[PDB]
Amino acid sequence: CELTNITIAIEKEECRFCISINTTWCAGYCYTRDLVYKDPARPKIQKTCTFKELVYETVRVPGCAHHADSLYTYPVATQCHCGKCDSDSTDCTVRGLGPSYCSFG
Amino acid sequence: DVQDCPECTLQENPFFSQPGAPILQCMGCCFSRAYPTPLRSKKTMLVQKNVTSESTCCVAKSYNRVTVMGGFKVENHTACHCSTCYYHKS
Amino acid sequence: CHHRICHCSNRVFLCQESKVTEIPSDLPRNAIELRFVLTKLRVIQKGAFSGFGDLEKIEISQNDVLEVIEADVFSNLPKLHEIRIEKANNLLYINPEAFQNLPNLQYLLISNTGIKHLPDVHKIHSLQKVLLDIQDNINIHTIERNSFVGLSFESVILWLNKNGIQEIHNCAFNGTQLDELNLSDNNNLEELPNDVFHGASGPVILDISRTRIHSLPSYGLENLKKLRARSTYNLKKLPTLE
Ligand SMILES: *[C@@H]1O[C@H](CO)[C@@H](O[C@@H]2O[C@H](CO)[C@@H](O)[C@H](O)[C@H]2NC(C)=O)[C@H](O)[C@H]1NC(C)=O
Ligand SMILES: *[C@@H]1O[C@H](CO)[C@@H](O)[C@H](O)[C@H]1NC(C)=O
Ligand SMILES: *[C@@H]1O[C@H](CO)[C@@H](O)[C@H](O)[C@H]1NC(C)=O
Ligand SMILES: *[C@@H]1O[C@H](CO)[C@@H](O)[C@H](O)[C@H]1NC(C)=O
Numbered sequence: 202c203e204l205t206n207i208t209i210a211i212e213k214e215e216c217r218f219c220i221s222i223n224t225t226w227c228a229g230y231c232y233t234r235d236l237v238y239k240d241p242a243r244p245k246i247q248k249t250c251t252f253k254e255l256v257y258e259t260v261r262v263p264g265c266a267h268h269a270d271s272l273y274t275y276p277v278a279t280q281c282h283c284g285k286c287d288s289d290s291t292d293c294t295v296r297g298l299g300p301s302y303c304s305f306g
Numbered sequence: 307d308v309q310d311c312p313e314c315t316l317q318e319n320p321f322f323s324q325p326g327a328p329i330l331q332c333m334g335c336c337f338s339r340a341y342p343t344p345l346r347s348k349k350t351m352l353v354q355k356n357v358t359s360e361s362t363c364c365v366a367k368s369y370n371r372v373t374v375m376g377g378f379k380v381e382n383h384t385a386c387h388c389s390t391c392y393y394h395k396s
Numbered sequence: 397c398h399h400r401i402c403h404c405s406n407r408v409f410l411c412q413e414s415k416v417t418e419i420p421s422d423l424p425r426n427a428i429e430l431r432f433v434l435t436k437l438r439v440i441q442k443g444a445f446s447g448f449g450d451l452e453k454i455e456i457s458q459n460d461v462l463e464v465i466e467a468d469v470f471s472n473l474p475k476l477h478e479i480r481i482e483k484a485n486n487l488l489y490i491n492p493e494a495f496q497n498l499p500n501l502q503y504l505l506i507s508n509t510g511i512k513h514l515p516d517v518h519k520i521h522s523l524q525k526v527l528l529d530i531q532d533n534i535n536i537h538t539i540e541r542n543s544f545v546g547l548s549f550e551s552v553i554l555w556l557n558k559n560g561i562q563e564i565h566n567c568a569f570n571g572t573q574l575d576e577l578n579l580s581d582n583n584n585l586e587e588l589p590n591d592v593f594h595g596a597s598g599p600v601i602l603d604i605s606r607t608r609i610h611s612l613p614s615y616g617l618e619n620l621k622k623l624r625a626r627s628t629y630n631l632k633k634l635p636t637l638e
């Protein structure tokens with residue numbers, strides 16, 4: 202589990218397109234076990250690959266027809282770890298749509 | 307790359323194993339990852355999350371519930387796989 | 397493998413970016429997993445998953461216009477272990493008879509939804525320990541007399557985490573063996589009826605973090621081993637029989 206370079210897709214609804222941006226996120230392996238003895242008072246813990254610290258950066262997004270350029274703010278991992286996904290800021294699923302997902306094309 | 311993290315598999319539990327009759331356990335490493343939530347996703351959710359995480363966990367695909375020594379009932383795992391995590395949140 | 401709108405992969409079906417308002421009838425009867433993602437489904441009809449004696453998981457995720465779950469959608473599903481309803485923005489109604497006898501239900505997840513009421517689980521009668529994990533449903537404000545009765549014949553974990561719960565009624569957990577209870581982040585909840593745990597195996601672990609609760613009922617907490625509030629407790633208190 203380490204910081205990796207990925208390509209995320211940023212999409213402009215009005216313009217019916219996405220632009221691709223290279224950034225840095227988390228991916229890799231983390232250790233987990235599955236208990237064989239259950240103490241209802243000592244439940245299990247699992248860890249996932251995810252950010253420990255992140256920053257925001259902005260990017261200019263092309264316009265079209267009747268819509269001028271815009272700005273978009275996005276998250277950038279600065280440090281990963283095997284931890285708990287922070288459900289305040291994170292959507293903890295099995296599968297998302299993927300970084301470079303686009304409604305068009 | 308392959309820095310080291312052993313693959314999810316069956317192993318013997320040192321604390322409940324006995325010579326001639328071991329009990330096995332799923333432990334190891336699964337793949338997971340975090341990345342910016344697709345704008346499209348944010349539309350399916352009443353509560354906005356700028357980051358999305360997908361994760362899988364090392365768990366028992368099939369098991370047997372046997373009893374050992376001190377009158378503890380335990381699970382004897384027969385198959386492992388990386389599957390859904392239920393205890394990794396917040 | 398393919399069908400126009402859905403991929404019959406290897407016993408694992410995915411309806412993504414759908415050409416459907418209803419779940420297709422012509423889905424192969426021997427599926428282990430059905431995933432409906434980014435769909436245009438408005439309703440999940442009655443007996444939708446009727447005839448799948450091999451179904452193990454149903455993922456309903458990121459469905460923008462899913463609004464209604466009919467009666468008897470989850471029934472006659474002997475192998476079903478996991479139901480995951482995630483991210484249905486406009487799902488405001490689940491029919492009080494949606495779930496019915498799933499001897500094998502281990503996991504039931506409902507999150508980031510618009511439902512205003514907790515599911516009716518009293519007909520499930522699952523033979524295994526169930527993890528009931530209902531979260532981020534900002535419109536659920538109340539738990540009522542007998543909400544989790546009949547869910548399972550054993551230890552049940554209830555994560556009623558992060559909704560808009562403001563009121564819990566007495567005997568909410570009546571007839572239930574409360575393994576764990578999480579009522580964290582329901583930050584308008586400030587009282588527990590002195591009869592909440594009436595007729596229950598009482599929480600072993602109890603999570604009241606980020607609520608306005610400032611006291612617990614006198615009985616029902618006889619098995620409390622852990623209390624999560626502002627910090628966690630165990631041998632930091634011997635009166636963990638409050
Ligand atoms: C408390 O829990 C029990 C179930 O464990 C509720 O059910 C009573 O007992 C049997 C089933 O064990 C039912 O057939 C009856 O319908 C129930 N009796 C009554 C008086 O309702 C019981 O209802 C719950 N108690 C409360 C306060 O509603
Ligand atoms: C990501 O790509 C940049 C070059 O565009 C590179 O400098 C950097 O080392 C890469 N990130 C990592 C952590 O390998
Ligand atoms: C980011 O770098 C990768 C290869 O390192 C490449 O596929 C891609 O073209 C780069 N993105 C941009 C915006 O040029
Ligand atoms: C646990 O199962 C394995 C086979 O999967 C077997 O070799 C072992 O003897 C079993 N142990 C017990 C305690 O029955």
Ligand SMILES: *[C@@H]1O[C@H](CO)[C@@H](O)[C@H](O)[C@H]1NC(C)=O
Nearest residue numbers: 257274275289290354355356
């Ligand atoms: C998440 O992103 C939105 C823009 O999409 C931004 O305005 C907001 O400040 C971000 N939230 C957090 C927790 O930083």
